[PDB]
């Protein structure tokens, strides 16, 4: 691979279901704080969550995210969805003055 910071172009779910999303990262990163923050603006990013940088989960409301250090890749995951959720999202890394992203377009679809 080449491009330092991955992920898929595009993720689905269901109002009142459940979406992951997986972040490769290259080797160098993986100390980094990861977090993912919803809009196409990378400025008024709007954070949702974020790591310190260890493996530890840490969730805040609706959005939980996991760093396994040792694939190199973190996991966003999103409960309870909601309509108002589809949006752009970046899956961001970042520490000590560098910094990585890439967006993802979240999908949300109804039931009833």
């Given at each position: 691979g080449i491009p330092q910071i991955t992920g898929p172009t595009t993720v689905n779910g269901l109002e009142r279901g459940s979406l992951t999303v997986q972040?490769?990262?290259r080797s160098?990163?993986?100390t980094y704080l990861k977090?993912?923050?919803?809009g196409a603006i990378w400025r008024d990013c709007k954070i949702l969550v974020?790591?310190?940088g260890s493996e530890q989960?840490?969730?805040?409301d609706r959005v939980s995210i996991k760093d396994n250090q040792k694939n190199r890749t973190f996991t966003v995951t999103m409960?309870?969805?909601m309509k108002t959720d589809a949006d752009t999202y970046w899956c961001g890394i970042?520490?000590?003055?560098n910094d990585l992203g890439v967006t993802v377009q979240v999908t949300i679809d109804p039931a009833p």
């Open positions: 972040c490769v990262y160098g990163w993986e977090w993912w923050c919803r974020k790591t310190s989960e840490v969730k805040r409960e309870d969805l970042e520490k000590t003055g």
